[PDB]
């Protein structure tokens, strides 16, 4: 890295700097005073202080990117969100008054809830023992869990099974399905959970 180790990652949060001094604790005050003497990396172009910034959606867009084509990936993401919102509006209008309250129309909430539902709880690690390889169930960190959800969503949307269907439409359909706890990705999570439950007897093989 061209940044010396002295450099620190910048913190982009307006509320963090607009916080009143009186509310600040001694630890926070000391941290703020110390940060005046450190070196700070340049703010990355990906993230800004815009109120419409979503780190989850930015990460999903980066994972969808192919060959550094972030314009196309961002276009696909915004088209997917627009398609989700349009489908939700269509369902809202076509539904009765009772069902209108339950129908969700925020694409961001739908996306976050779909990823949260797609998140696996217990993973499998291949462990060598006695010359064999065993799929030992293991706990998963939240980071790996979110990454697995995102990667499963993207891989399922990129599957060749869907013919001539554009990525925004496929991704919107999968997001709506996952938001309702249905679809191939939720089935993949269930299959992982079932395999872990079956291999539960191998859990003692783990040494960590």
């Amino acid at each position: 890295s061209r940044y010396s180790p002295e450099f620190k990652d910048p913190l982009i949060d307006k509320e963090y700097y607009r916080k009143p001094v009186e509310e600040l604790t001694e630890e926070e005050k000391y941290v703020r005073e110390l940060k005046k003497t450190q070196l700070i990396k340049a703010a990355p172009a990906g993230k800004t202080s815009s109120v419409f910034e979503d780190p989850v959606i930015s990460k999903f867009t980066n994972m969808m990117m192919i060959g550094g084509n972030k314009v196309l990936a961002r276009s696909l993401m915004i088209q997917t969100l627009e398609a989700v919102k349009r489908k939700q509006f269509e369902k809202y209008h076509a539904a009765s008054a009772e069902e209108q309250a339950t129908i969700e129309r925020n694409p961001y909430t739908i996306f976050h809830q779909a990823l949260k539902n797609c998140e696996p709880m217990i993973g499998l690690v291949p462990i060598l023992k006695g010359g064999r390889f065993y799929q030992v169930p293991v706990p998963l960190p939240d980071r790996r869990r979110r990454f697995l959800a995102m990667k499963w969503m993207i891989t399922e949307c990129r599957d060749k099974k869907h013919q001539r269907t554009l990525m925004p439409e496929k991704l919107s359909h999968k997001l709506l399905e996952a938001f309702h706890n249905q679809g191939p990705v939720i089935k993949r999570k269930h299959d992982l959970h079932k395999m872990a439950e079956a291999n539960r007897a191998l859990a003692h093989y783990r040494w960590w």
């Binding site: 005046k36 990396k41 202080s49 815009s50």
Partner: protein, 246 residues
Amino acid sequence: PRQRAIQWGEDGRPFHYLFYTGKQSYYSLMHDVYGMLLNLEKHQVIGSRWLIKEELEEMLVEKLSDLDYMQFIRLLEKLLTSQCGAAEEEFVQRFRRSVTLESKKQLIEPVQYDEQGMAFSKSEGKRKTAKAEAIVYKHGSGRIKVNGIDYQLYFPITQDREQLMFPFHFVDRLGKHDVTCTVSGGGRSAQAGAIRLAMAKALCSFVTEDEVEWMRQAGLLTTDPRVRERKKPGQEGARRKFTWKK
């Protein structure tokens, strides 16, 4: 190089009583410091640093080891910790060196005035191969002209427009300053980054010092040193090696 004088006379008798230790200067220094500590026992930071081992060797005209330097520095710190007098402080200050604490505070551009009397600040920025020179006026409607073109026409990508929005929005000054920036070189994103850096640097002249510090901490005023890495011979790219066959 500084050379130590002959350490014994015609008769052969060495001048210093610690000659046969082989490190008479260092051990004499340690002896004096220990004696000062004993005297102090009998009686009962930011702008300075301890000298490095090389400085101590230059002072003593004797080769030293890292552990010897550690022992000396520990003894000096123990000397400082006590209720030292004026002479005991002068002895310490003999070895203490001065460190220039360069302020990380961003330099504020002077506020210049045009023919019409409007106030403005000019700055420059670089991102990869892109160089941008920006002028930010104290009063404005938020209009930004890039090479005489509106920034929404010049930047048809939402990411670049968000990059432009970042400095003003971070200090809650959207639509309050008019900007005229000329950028040359690099791609669209490098140009947007350079314009962002120049705009933030210029806008520092019209915000409070705390706001300038916040912008610096947010990364709006650091010149991004990340530039393209040269391709090396014998490998496909900057880091990509040729496929290796075993």
